[PDB]
Amino acid sequence: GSEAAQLLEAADFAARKHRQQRRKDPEGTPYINHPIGVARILTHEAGITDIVVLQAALLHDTVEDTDTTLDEVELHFGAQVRRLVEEVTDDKTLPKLERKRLQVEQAPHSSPGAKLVKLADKLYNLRDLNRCTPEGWSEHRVQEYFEWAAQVVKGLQGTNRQLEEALKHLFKQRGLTI
Amino acid sequence: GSEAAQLLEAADFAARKHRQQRRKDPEGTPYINHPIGVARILTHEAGITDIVVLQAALLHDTVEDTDTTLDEVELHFGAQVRRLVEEVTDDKTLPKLERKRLQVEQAPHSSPGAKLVKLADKLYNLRDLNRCTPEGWSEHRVQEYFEWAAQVVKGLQGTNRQLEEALKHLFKQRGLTI
Ligand SMILES: [Mn+2]
Ligand SMILES: [Mn+2]
């Protein structure tokens, strides 16, 4: 009913599903901080106000890494949100390398909404990598992540000038172009 | 900027400040889940849409338990929010028993916004206690909390029918009236 209630519903849902999950930083930061930050990037830097998109950002990793079904997502947020979540859900049954290939291949075919979420997700992760190296990650692994990230972003271009410029800038710092 | 951006700003701010904090439940759930749950109570059950009140709910424990100053809160959310946060910040320099006494005495003198946050905070904590006994907590300590909570809520009455009825019901189950 309310825009405020809608956002809190998604945040709460995500917080509960990710309650046992943590990031790979030395402090093992609560995972929920990530979805929240991704959504925030969209409102503050991308100027996104579409509630459907913001909810998908908050829930973008729920079906992927937690005990959540597509039906459950549609039940609480509608088919529009569920569909976006589908587009941003990696297939965890595939080898890591294969998943990376899929993201690159699927990038251009994503809906505008999914492209926004994918862009914000990448921006949050690159900034986080620049801020702190994940536990057990070599510098080569970080650079590798950026290289792969570039492959994906190139397919998401023409969606949001603010996010793309920010991403392009961070990529340039590591010798990567668009 | 926008209602969406405003909620996410508070959510993000609180998530970062509470990143190292955890609830007292067995699994040690990320503390951020509590403020998110309190604000959600306000939108979903109390029907609150006032962005200022919802932000205060999300930040209700920031100055109290984290490295956050009143000025920092005002800087990011304005004086209105900082004021509400002030009203809901317990003095951690006081012995626990004194803090409990303070909340009881202060209840009736709180502003409408502050009474809403206090009511939602209590409802979340009572439900949580009914759902799971905190680690190292005896059943008598659980009951003690309810008795104390009843004293505080009695002074917050006449603010929101939905929250007050819910609280009244939970209190009655444990032999406590209003
Ligand atoms: Mn993500
Ligand atoms: Mn609280």
Amino acid at site B133: T
Between the alpha carbon of residue B54 and those of residues A21, B34, B46, B73, the distances in Å are 26, 13, 11, 14
Q: Which fold, A1-178?
A: Hypothetical protein af1432 (1.10.3210)
Round to whole Å and give the CA distance between B10 and B59: 7
Q: What is the DSSP letter of B160?
A: -
Round to whole Å and give the CA distance between B100 and B146: 12
Longest dimension (CA), chain A: 48
Residue ranges at the known binding site of A: 34, 60-61, 121
Ligand 2 centre distance from Cα of residue B61 (Å): 6
- B70, exposed or middle or buried, with CB in 10 Å at 0-12, 13-18, 19+? middle
Distance of alpha carbon A58 from the chain centroid: 9
Round to whole Å and give the CA distance between A111 and A146: 23
Nearest to B152 by CA among B169, B138, B171: B171
Nearest to A84 by CA among A73, A72, A76: A73
Resolution in A: 1.9
Give start and end residues of each alpha helix (H) in chain A: 3-17, 33-44, 51-59, 62-65, 70-87, 96-106, 112-131, 139-156, 161-172
B87 counts as catalytic? no
Nearest to B76 by CA among B19, B17, B121, B32: B17
Amino acid at site B5: A
The values of phi and psi at residue B67, to 5°, are -75, 75
Both tokens assigned to A129: 């990598």
Round to whole Å and give the CA distance between B62 and B92: 12
Q: Is B22 helix (H, G, I), strand (E, B) or coil?
A: strand
Distance of alpha carbon B32 from the chain centroid: 12
B65 counts as catalytic? yes
Nearest to B4 by CA among A120, A76, A10, A23: A10
Q: Is A22 helix (H, G, I), strand (E, B) or coil?
A: strand
Both tokens assigned to B116: 């809403």
Q: How was it solved?
A: X-ray
Distance from CA of A158 to the nearest CA of B (A): 23
Whether A7 and B8 lie within 8 Å, measured CB to CB: yes
Nearest to A160 by CA among A106, A109, A123: A123
Round to whole Å and give the CA distance between B90 and B80: 18
Between the alpha carbon of residue B33 and those of residues A8, A100, B107, the distances in Å are 11, 31, 24
Looking at all shown ligands, the one closest to residue B56's CA atom is 2
Cβ proximity of B90 and B103 under 8 Å: yes
Round to whole Å and give the CA distance between B36 and B76: 18
Give me Rg for the CA atoms of chain A: 16
| DSSP-assigned letters across all residues of B35-62 | HHHHHHHHHHTS----HHHHHHHHHTTH
B108 CB-near residues (< 8 Å, 6+ apart): B155, B156
Which residue bears the tokens 């406590």?
B176
Domain boundaries in chain B?
A: 1-178
Round to whole Å and give the CA distance between A110 and B116: 42
For A137, half-sphere exposure in the C-beta direction (CA atoms, 13 angstrom radius) is 16
A97 CB-near residues (< 8 Å, 6+ apart): none
Q: Is A1 helix (H, G, I), strand (E, B) or coil?
A: coil
* Residue B109 is labelled as binding a ligand: no
Round to whole Å and give the CA distance between B36 and A160: 29
